[PDB]
């Protein structure tokens, strides 16, 4: 369905990059192929490839630039604005992508990465804005090299990391990598403590676009953590690239308060997510509890990270299959929907090379993703935490509001929705985002009926 019909230029409609750093953006575009793209008003230093939809180059001057994009095919055309903010901020919308950890663990290969990029090109995800392809732990060897450089495991990446980066950038993808603020990662292979500048330089030379920085084997002290993250954050900013800094100390030291100060763009708020509803240790519902009161700390350029998506894993995993039950599809959809409402990173953890329709139905929901990528970048408020359900509210950039009603229990639940449910709610026009259709219930409100584990998401104006 993504590759049928008139073109449609999908979010994000706003992108940020540091000045004088490499710039790369594939324009996510639904519609029948082939498509041809046009851009009017691209800033100095950027060029569009009209046949591939990739904007590439480098803008030296700080600024906000409004580019008009057009995509055309045999059935018609779509015209849309791209706001390019060349500035002090990255991730003006939440990062979307895939991470190697939740399914593959230490079974990384160059083959997996290139095949994952190819799948995303061909399966719809790239055209819905999934861009970051992130290497997690175990790409490197256990010991630092005798020359003081971190060693790529060349049984896994026999042409090195840059080869993968190059391949990914050819298709508009971003490369993520992983290290740890200690001598050893969570997995026991080489970390970066004390070598931040030399590792950041290497990362940059390989074309890395994102660093996840873990905290295993580091001392628990909050000041010690802050200093260690600051070292790496400054090292990343001293390179010639815009590198996303993903902070990963499991929320233990309230990173939402200090992560932006040490140069982070996203920060883990909890321990590691499991493929389970409610307690590879934290359940989906436990993570919601943690993240709910943190909505004031998120905004364009800095997001609360409730960890990687477990949509589509169904218990099957070489990293978290041990301590994980598998969820219902209802529960997976509620998981994705809530990650979208919370302006969370949408980093898939399943094997995107092969997906069932039920998984595709969730991860390719353009409307939920559109909520996630709303340029206001407000993390939804959990307006009401009742005994059996939640009501969450996300103001959107056209003045509408997204409302999510979630059933947290294993029996059916009724949730009354009316104009006093949350501040400033209008119900004259209500769109059901999971069904993709207008709701024909009363403008004075109605009872939402939720099956066990079900979330309903409405856009309300």
Automatic annotation (TrEMBL):
> Disulfide connectivity?
186-216
Catalysed transformations (reactions): Hydrolysis of terminal, non-reducing alpha-D-galactose residues in alpha-D-galactosides, including galactose oligosaccharides, galactomannans and galactolipids
Q: Which domain of life is it from?
A: Bacteria
Molecular function (GO) terms listed?
Answer: alpha-galactosidase activity
Q: Which residues cross the membrane?
A: none
- Which Enzyme Commission numbers does its entry carry? 3.2.1.22
Give me any GO biological process, just one.
carbohydrate catabolic process
A Pfam family annotated for this UniProt entry: Melibiase_C
Answer yes or no on keyword Nucleus.
no
Provide the alphabetized UniProt keywords. Disulfide bond, Glycosidase, Hydrolase, Signal
| Alpha galactosidase C-terminal domain sequence ranges | 388-458
- Which protein family is it in? Belongs to the glycosyl hydrolase 27 family.
Protein name per Swiss-Prot or TrEMBL: Alpha-galactosidase
